[PDB]
Amino acid sequence: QDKATDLQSIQDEISALTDEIDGISNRTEFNGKKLLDGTYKVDTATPANQ
Amino acid sequence: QDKATDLQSIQDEISALTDEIDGISNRTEFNGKKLLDGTYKVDTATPANQ
């Protein structure tokens, strides 16, 4: 699976997919409200910001 | 139930209802005589003004 740029191509594809994960994590909204992003972290070192 | 202005709307509704409680407490009259308002308090710190 070499040429190494024939991995660059795969890399490009994968990077596009990770961009889509960023997309979904950002654009997911119920009545305008973003959910998946870090707004709703489980438990930080400061539990006052859960 | 967020957007927070989609709570502002609810707030507006509730504030209208509280205005209606003020209404009823003021406009309630038997032969012109207001009853519900503080005219007829139970017992103040001055019982001379019950």
Side-chain angles (χ1 to χ4, degrees):
Chain A
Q1 295 298 109
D2 196 74
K3 181 67 173 181
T5 62
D6 296 333
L7 295 174
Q8 181 71 44
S9 66
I10 296 169
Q11 183 67 41
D12 293 331
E13 184 175 359
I14 297 168
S15 66
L17 295 174
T18 60
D19 292 331
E20 180 63 28
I21 297 169
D22 291 330
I24 297 169
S25 65
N26 290 317
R27 68 186 67 187
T28 301
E29 291 183 352
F30 182 77
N31 191 0
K33 186 182 286 184
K34 293 182 184 292
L35 295 174
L36 294 174
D37 194 356
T39 301
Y40 293 99
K41 181 69 176 177
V42 176
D43 189 356
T44 62
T46 301
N49 291 319
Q50 293 181 359
Chain B
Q1 295 298 109
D2 196 74
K3 181 67 173 181
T5 62
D6 296 333
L7 295 174
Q8 181 71 44
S9 66
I10 296 169
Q11 183 67 41
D12 293 331
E13 184 175 359
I14 297 168
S15 66
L17 295 174
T18 60
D19 292 331
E20 180 63 28
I21 297 169
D22 291 330
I24 297 169
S25 65
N26 290 317
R27 68 186 67 187
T28 301
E29 291 183 352
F30 182 77
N31 191 0
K33 186 182 286 184
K34 293 182 184 292
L35 295 174
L36 294 174
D37 194 356
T39 301
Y40 293 99
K41 181 69 176 177
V42 176
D43 189 356
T44 62
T46 301
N49 291 319
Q50 293 181 359

